Write an enzyme that holds these catalytic residues in place. Structure first.
Site, PDB file in Angstrom:
ATOM      1  N   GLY A  88       2.478  64.475  74.100  1.00 22.10           N
ATOM      2  CA  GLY A  88       3.038  63.095  73.596  1.00 22.10           C
ATOM      3  C   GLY A  88       4.057  62.930  72.769  1.00 22.10           C
ATOM      4  N   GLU A 134      -0.500  65.302  62.920  1.00 23.68           N
ATOM      5  CA  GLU A 134      -0.020  64.219  63.694  1.00 23.68           C
ATOM      6  C   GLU A 134       1.285  63.532  62.801  1.00 23.68           C
ATOM      7  OE1 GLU A 134      -4.335  63.159  66.142  1.00 23.68           O
ATOM      8  OE2 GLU A 134      -2.724  61.589  66.144  1.00 23.68           O
ATOM      9  N   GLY A 182       0.878  63.192  78.621  1.00 26.70           N
ATOM     10  CA  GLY A 182      -0.122  63.737  77.623  1.00 26.70           C
ATOM     11  C   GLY A 182      -1.298  62.916  77.903  1.00 26.70           C
ATOM     12  N   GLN A 183      -2.546  63.390  77.058  1.00 23.86           N
ATOM     13  CA  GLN A 183      -3.719  62.662  77.679  1.00 23.86           C
ATOM     14  C   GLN A 183      -3.576  61.397  77.180  1.00 23.86           C
ATOM     15  OE1 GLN A 183      -7.566  64.315  75.993  1.00 23.86           O
ATOM     16  NE2 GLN A 183      -7.631  62.431  74.913  1.00 23.86           N
ATOM     17  N   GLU A 201      15.057  39.467  79.465  1.00 24.28           N
ATOM     18  CA  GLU A 201      15.465  38.216  78.830  1.00 24.28           C
ATOM     19  C   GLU A 201      14.807  38.039  77.375  1.00 24.28           C
ATOM     20  OE1 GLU A 201      16.357  34.853  81.222  1.00 24.28           O
ATOM     21  OE2 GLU A 201      15.304  33.789  79.815  1.00 24.28           O
ATOM     22  N   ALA A 246       0.251  71.714  74.340  1.00 26.30           N
ATOM     23  CA  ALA A 246       1.334  71.873  73.142  1.00 26.30           C
ATOM     24  C   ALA A 246       0.316  72.296  72.095  1.00 26.30           C
ATOM     25  CB  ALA A 246       2.109  70.960  73.237  1.00 26.30           C
ATOM     26  N   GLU A 257      -1.727  70.592  80.194  1.00 27.36           N
ATOM     27  CA  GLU A 257      -3.062  71.359  80.673  1.00 27.36           C
ATOM     28  C   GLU A 257      -3.499  70.224  81.723  1.00 27.36           C
ATOM     29  OE1 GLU A 257      -6.559  70.254  79.793  1.00 27.36           O
ATOM     30  OE2 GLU A 257      -6.105  68.726  78.363  1.00 27.36           O
ATOM     31  N   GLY A 272       0.942  67.194  70.931  1.00 30.62           N
ATOM     32  CA  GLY A 272       2.088  68.010  71.122  1.00 30.62           C
ATOM     33  C   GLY A 272       2.822  67.631  72.260  1.00 30.62           C
ATOM     34  N   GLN A 284      -4.357  58.577  80.007  1.00 30.46           N
ATOM     35  CA  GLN A 284      -5.714  57.871  80.113  1.00 30.46           C
ATOM     36  C   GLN A 284      -5.115  56.271  79.985  1.00 30.46           C
ATOM     37  OE1 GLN A 284      -9.228  60.741  78.979  1.00 30.46           O
ATOM     38  NE2 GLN A 284      -8.238  59.577  77.295  1.00 30.46           N
TER      39      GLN A 284
HETATM   40  N1  GTP Z   1      -5.547  55.045  72.508  1.00 29.67           N
HETATM   41  C1  GTP Z   1      -5.747  56.251  72.948  1.00 29.67           C
HETATM   42  N2  GTP Z   1      -5.433  57.087  72.060  1.00 29.67           N
HETATM   43  C2  GTP Z   1      -5.601  58.316  72.694  1.00 29.67           C
HETATM   44  C3  GTP Z   1      -5.964  58.707  73.716  1.00 29.67           C
HETATM   45  N3  GTP Z   1      -5.896  60.234  73.915  1.00 29.67           N
HETATM   46  C4  GTP Z   1      -5.594  60.540  72.835  1.00 29.67           C
HETATM   47  N4  GTP Z   1      -5.188  59.652  71.915  1.00 29.67           N
HETATM   48  C5  GTP Z   1      -4.486  59.739  70.615  1.00 29.67           C
HETATM   49  O1  GTP Z   1      -3.466  60.609  70.739  1.00 29.67           O
HETATM   50  C6  GTP Z   1      -3.148  61.350  69.619  1.00 29.67           C
HETATM   51  C7  GTP Z   1      -3.396  62.811  70.329  1.00 29.67           C
HETATM   52  O2  GTP Z   1      -2.490  63.101  71.518  1.00 29.67           O
HETATM   53  P1  GTP Z   1      -3.081  63.413  72.672  1.00 29.67           P
HETATM   54  O3  GTP Z   1      -2.190  62.480  73.743  1.00 29.67           O
HETATM   55  O4  GTP Z   1      -4.497  63.396  72.962  1.00 29.67           O
HETATM   56  O5  GTP Z   1      -2.269  64.748  72.996  1.00 29.67           O
HETATM   57  P2  GTP Z   1      -1.364  65.319  74.275  1.00 29.67           P
HETATM   58  O6  GTP Z   1      -0.300  64.465  74.566  1.00 29.67           O
HETATM   59  O7  GTP Z   1      -2.155  65.734  75.390  1.00 29.67           O
HETATM   60  O8  GTP Z   1      -0.785  66.735  73.360  1.00 29.67           O
HETATM   61  P3  GTP Z   1      -1.490  68.198  73.500  1.00 29.67           P
HETATM   62  O9  GTP Z   1      -2.819  68.255  73.905  1.00 29.67           O
HETATM   63  O10 GTP Z   1      -1.314  68.621  71.880  1.00 29.67           O
HETATM   64  O11 GTP Z   1      -0.509  69.144  74.460  1.00 29.67           O
HETATM   65  C8  GTP Z   1      -4.381  60.937  68.999  1.00 29.67           C
HETATM   66  O12 GTP Z   1      -3.863  59.976  67.819  1.00 29.67           O
HETATM   67  C9  GTP Z   1      -5.537  60.310  69.646  1.00 29.67           C
HETATM   68  O13 GTP Z   1      -6.087  59.378  68.978  1.00 29.67           O
HETATM   69  C10 GTP Z   1      -6.725  57.629  74.643  1.00 29.67           C
HETATM   70  O14 GTP Z   1      -6.821  57.550  75.965  1.00 29.67           O
HETATM   71  N5  GTP Z   1      -6.251  56.552  74.018  1.00 29.67           N
HETATM   72 MG    MG Z   2      -3.345  67.425  75.690  1.00 30.63          MG
END
Ligand code: GTP
Ligand code: MG
Ligand code: A1IM9
Ligand code: GDP
Ligand code: CA
Ligand code: MG
Lengths: 57, 439, 427
Positions: free
Chosen positions: B145, B182, B9-10, B253, B98, B70, B143, B14
């Site tokens: 993640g 969340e 996921g995002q 370890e 999701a 996506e 969703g 990232q």
């Molecule tokens: N540290 C950090 N948190 C992130 C980042 N992108 C999203 N978040 C956090 O992750 C959560 C949102 O989940 P995302 O990972 O964007 O969602 P996804 O897994 O892509 O799931 P869907 O878009 O619902 O399919 C929130 O708590 C955001 O603050 C990033 O690059 N770094």
């Molecule tokens: Mg996403």
């Protein structure tokens, strides 16, 4: 060693089965939600038939 | 002894971008994958080969899969700076995400892509001569993640058995959260994943946000700011796997000392020094300074107060210009001065590793380049505070079944919510019980 | 990539629909011939959400039971941008009668509309769902619009259905059966849409008259406000961004119980040109105005209820830190008005592109229990008529039975009670 093998195998097995059962239950549930929705929509089409019939008298 | 990284996921993607860029800079790998200092072409068994495979044309290729439901975040990897580092098949996307719903990630949408992701991970595994395990990077709150990660971790237990799975898990904060649900997603994934994960490093977005604001003077941190810091912490943790040296101590370890009972597997990471170029200028931050900074709650990657729980392990992972003499003197000072109570059933000794390779920073970053850094990994009962905060937000909404219809609509039942929440109550209680004194 | 299909039905629906297209086309740099002539890559990055593709064509279907509004749309500004085959119209009209739109004339036309919906849907890479613009107080938008919703939902049951639904007011139309058509329509919306923007002609009128000092507001004046709002509430769908970036993410954040899916939209700034001489346009001004009753496009006072969920979108160049600070302040000073059992229930997005002719703006989307005030107003007008069985023959003559009226009324009263229940619930 046989015990360690057995417990690793039993862990795999149980994780496999639990997942299969959840994905099936999930699928049947989602399907049923959809079937109910469509059945409401179909009741409405039947009702609109009756209205247009009621008008013809 | 290969490690396969999976970025889901995002947030997972990232953070993966940031980590792989930093790893390339630390090892001297160019964006096209070439590594002029590596004289074994097409293979070998260097420490860095735990994280990178090699092609005959000299490309050093991350042992990594990126997956998202996506395409738009992975599309940036595919078209950006490090696009030549990865094979196309390591970057996997669907078309519809999701929608911040665990049920969609684990079931409705997830199930359509899980087979393909497992196929691609298998092709990575097949190239390893001694795969040690997986590192899985994901949000709690999204969703994908939450729900896709859960599904994937269940499937990996089946296909790889008890091979090691570690997580880097992003715990939500209101300053950068994108969904009201969340808490639900966090509790669902924590429950589903708990028996499938050997060790999980939570990263509280609010702790990182605060560190960026306070110590780097960033007015309003972005993901980019957050992820650059997170990558340094990740790097500190995996450096034992990717570099060698006489005083390097493998992550496994530390793991031995960190995990006393299977469910008690959530270390607290604390990192120092986090400082700007302007403040680091003309200021040399000694081993004593950076070590004492690890017992400052403000430097922790999860908000909680260790001074009000008990320790079951304390590990110090140093990097750079650090020798044991200075370490030992620093620990000696800290022991005379800080709130460090162990449970009665553990040794109180700190476990130390040192990697000689100095820390690196990415161009245009916020962090000063420094000669020595440290990551403390502790097992403290205080980390349970993070579960209590999430649990409470879950309880508020769940009592009214707010938003639950979105999950039910995707095939879930209420019983899965109460089962997950019950397991979290048991986990909170596990953390109490382990801190109580022996009769 | 993630397409939305837009349908506009009836007079009101086509009029506000045409202004929506004019305003977002201008925002995305698309001219009346469909050519791109803008200056920022932000404009094209998510253009596919609303436009097919060296021309860009709205994914838009124009529906009515008489030709006149659609004829003026076609000769209006941006009227040659629409696909000619996407105009579907009859000749009969609906006579401001919901039953004619829903059960008789509308039913005769609906299959030909669905043909076009399907053609648009089928060439989507991954359709997200549908947006409908319509009034509730007439016949076609109200009766035929709600018919289309149910027919589309049958064929696309797992896609999102969103409406912009214009609620009647005696201040704007004197057509006496508007409360009947609106109650019958709300009955449908409660059951069959996922998200509804309640655009209240009462509020548009009062904004025009009291705030902007227009002595005799025209539909044009009202629609300018609507088009500002529609631009605002779709900003997260069509420009790059984090929050509420698709219809389903918006629904998941905004809709805690399926029937409670009626939003109060709001826009800032709304200050007369003469008061503009006195009051600076700043982030704190936007934030204060967006939470004020006078800036809401539904005539409900949020201080008479509580917020379940809120989405706030800022547009233009401004400090993210100042936005965060003002959004925290406004929540703290108003803490009583946000239910305590939905933690962190206000989300905030910022998009760098302002609306035309403003340096910055804000748009509010509230899921507030105070929306009960709008349903109650409609309900009171409905019952004053229905108690006397006034004007029922227009509906029974199309084959309806009194029982359907009783049932629509009860459902809408039940909606009101449910908002009250959650308003009074505590942690
Ligand atoms: N540290 C950090 N948190 C992130 C980042 N992108 C999203 N978040 C956090 O992750 C959560 C949102 O989940 P995302 O990972 O964007 O969602 P996804 O897994 O892509 O799931 P869907 O878009 O619902 O399919 C929130 O708590 C955001 O603050 C990033 O690059 N770094
Ligand atoms: Mg996403
Ligand atoms: C509106 C296009 C049009 O035909 C009317 C014209 C030329 C301008 C209208 C401006 C207007 O309605 O402005 C309002 C509001 O009065 N403006 C302010 O309050 C400005 C500053 C306040 C400071 C304290 C805002 C508005 C509804 C603007 C919208 C944005 S979408 C594009 C339309 C086009 O205008
Ligand atoms: N805001 C707005 N309301 C309108 C407009 N045209 C009509 N209405 C309102 O819509 C209702 C009449 O329905 P209308 O759309 O004309 O009938 P239809 O053509 O049968 O769908 C009344 O409440 C009118 O005040 C318009 O352009 N804008
Ligand atoms: Ca080599
Ligand atoms: Mg009309």
């Amino acid at each position: 060693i046989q015990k360690a093998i057995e417990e690793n195998n039993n862990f795999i097995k149980m994780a496999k089965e639990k997942l299969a059962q959840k994905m099936e239950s999930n699928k049947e549930n989602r399907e049923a939600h959809l079937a109910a929705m469509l059945e409401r929509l179909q009741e409405k089409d039947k009702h609109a038939e009756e209205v247009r019939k009621n008008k013809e008298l | 002894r290969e490690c396969i990284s999976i970025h889901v996921g995002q947030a997972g993607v990232q953070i993966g971008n940031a980590c792989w860029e930093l790893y390339c800079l630390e090892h001297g790998i160019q964006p096209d994958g070439q590594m002029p200092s590596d004289k074994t072409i097409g293979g070998g068994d260097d420490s860095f080969n735990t994280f990178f495979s090699e092609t005959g044309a000299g490309k050093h290729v991350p042992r990594a899969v990126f997956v998202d439901l996506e395409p738009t975040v992975i599309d940036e990897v595919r078209t950006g700076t490090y696009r030549q580092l990865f094979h196309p098949e390591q970057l996997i996307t669907g078309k519809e995400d999701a929608a911040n719903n665990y049920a969609r990630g684990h079931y409705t949408i997830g199930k359509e892509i899980i087979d393909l992701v497992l196929d691609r991970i298998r092709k990575l595994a097949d190239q390893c001569t001694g795969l040690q395990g997986f590192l899985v990077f994901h949000s709690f709150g999204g969703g994908t993640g939450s729900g896709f990660t859960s599904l994937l971790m269940e499937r990996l237990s089946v296909d790889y058995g008890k091979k090691s799975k570690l997580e880097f898990s992003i715990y939500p904060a209101p300053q950068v959260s994108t969904a009201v649900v969340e808490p639900y997603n966090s509790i669902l994934t924590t429950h589903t994943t708990l028996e499938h994960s050997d060790c999980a490093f939570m990263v509280d977005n609010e702790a990182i946000y605060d560190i960026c604001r306070r110590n780097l003077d960033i007015e309003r941190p972005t993901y980019t700011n957050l992820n650059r810091l997170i990558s340094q912490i990740v790097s500190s943790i995996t450096a034992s796997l990717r570099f060698d040296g006489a005083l390097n101590v493998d992550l496994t370890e530390f793991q031995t000392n960190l995990v006393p009972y299977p469910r008690i597997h959530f270390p607290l990471a604390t990192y120092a020094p986090v400082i700007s170029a302007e403040k680091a200028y003309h200021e040399q931050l000694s081993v004593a300074e950076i070590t004492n900074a690890c017992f400052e709650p403000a430097n922790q990657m999860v908000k909680c107060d260790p001074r009000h729980g008990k320790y079951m392990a304390c590990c110090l992972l140093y990097r750079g210009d650090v020798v044991p003499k200075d370490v030992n003197a620093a620990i000696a000072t800290i022991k005379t001065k800080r709130s460090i109570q162990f449970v009665d059933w553990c040794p109180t000794g700190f476990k130390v590793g040192i990697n000689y390779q100095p820390p690196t920073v990415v161009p245009g970053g916020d962090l000063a380049k420094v000669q020595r850094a440290v990551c403390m990994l502790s097992n403290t009962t205080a980390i349970a505070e993070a579960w209590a905060r999430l649990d409470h937000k879950f309880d508020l909404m769940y009592a009214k079944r707010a938003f639950v219809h979105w999950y039910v609509g995707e095939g879930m039942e209420e019983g899965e919510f109460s089962e997950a929440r019950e397991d979290m109550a048991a986990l909170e209680k596990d953390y109490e019980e382990v801190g109580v004194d022996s009769v | 990539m993630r397409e939305i299909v837009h349908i506009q039905a009836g007079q009101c629906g086509n009029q506000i629909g045409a202004k929506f297209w004019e305003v977002i086309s201008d925002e995305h740099g698309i001219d009346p011939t469909g050519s791109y002539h803008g200056d920022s890559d932000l404009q094209l990055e998510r253009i596919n959400v609303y436009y097919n593709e060296n021309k860009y064509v709205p994914r838009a279907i124009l529906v009515d039971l008489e030709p006149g509004t659609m004829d003026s749309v076609r000769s209006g500004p941006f009227g040659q941008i629409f696909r000619p085959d996407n105009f579907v119209f009859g000749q009969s009209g609906a006579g401001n009668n919901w039953a004619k739109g829903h059960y008789t004339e509308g039913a005769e036309l609906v299959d030909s509309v669905l043909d076009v919906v399907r053609k648009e849907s089928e060439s989507c890479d991954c359709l997200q769902g549908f947006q409908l613009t319509h009034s509730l107080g007439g016949g076609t938008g109200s009766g035929m619009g709600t018919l289309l919703i149910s027919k589309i939902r049958e064929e696309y049951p797992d896609r999102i259905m969103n409406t912009f639904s214009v609620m009647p007011s005696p201040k704007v139309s004197d057509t006496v059966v508007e409360p009947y058509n609106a109650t019958l329509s709300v009955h449908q919306l409660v059951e069959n849409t996922d998200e509804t923007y309640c655009i209240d002609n009462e509020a548009l009128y009062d904004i025009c008259f009291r705030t902007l000092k227009l002595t005799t507001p025209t539909y044009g004046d009202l629609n300018h406000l609507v088009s500002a709002t529609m631009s605002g509430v779709t900003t997260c769908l069509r420009f790059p961004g984090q929050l509420n970036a698709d219809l389903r993410k918006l629904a998941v954040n905004m809709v805690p119980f399926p029937r409670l899916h009626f939003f109060m939209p709001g826009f800032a700034p709304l200050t007369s040109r003469g008061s503009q001489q006195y009051r600076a346009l700043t982030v704190p001004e936007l934030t204060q105005q967006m939470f004020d009753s006078k800036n809401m496009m539904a005539a409900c006072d949020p201080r008479h209820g509580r917020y379940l969920t809120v989405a706030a979108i800022f547009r233009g160049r401004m400090s993210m830190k100042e936005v965060d600070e003002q959004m925290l302040n406004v929540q703290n000073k108003n803490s009583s008005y946000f239910v305590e059992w939905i933690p962190n229930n206000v989300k905030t997005a910022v998009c760098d592109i302002p609306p035309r002719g403003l340096k910055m703006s804000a748009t509010f989307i509230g899921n507030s229990t105070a929306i009960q005030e709008l349903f109650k107003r409609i309900s009171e007008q409905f019952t004053a008529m229905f108690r006397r069985k006034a004007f029922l023959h227009w509906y029974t003559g199309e084959g309806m039975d009194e029982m359907e009226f009783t049932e629509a009324e009860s459902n809408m009263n039940d909606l009101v009670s449910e908002y009250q229940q959650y308003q009074d619930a505590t942690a």
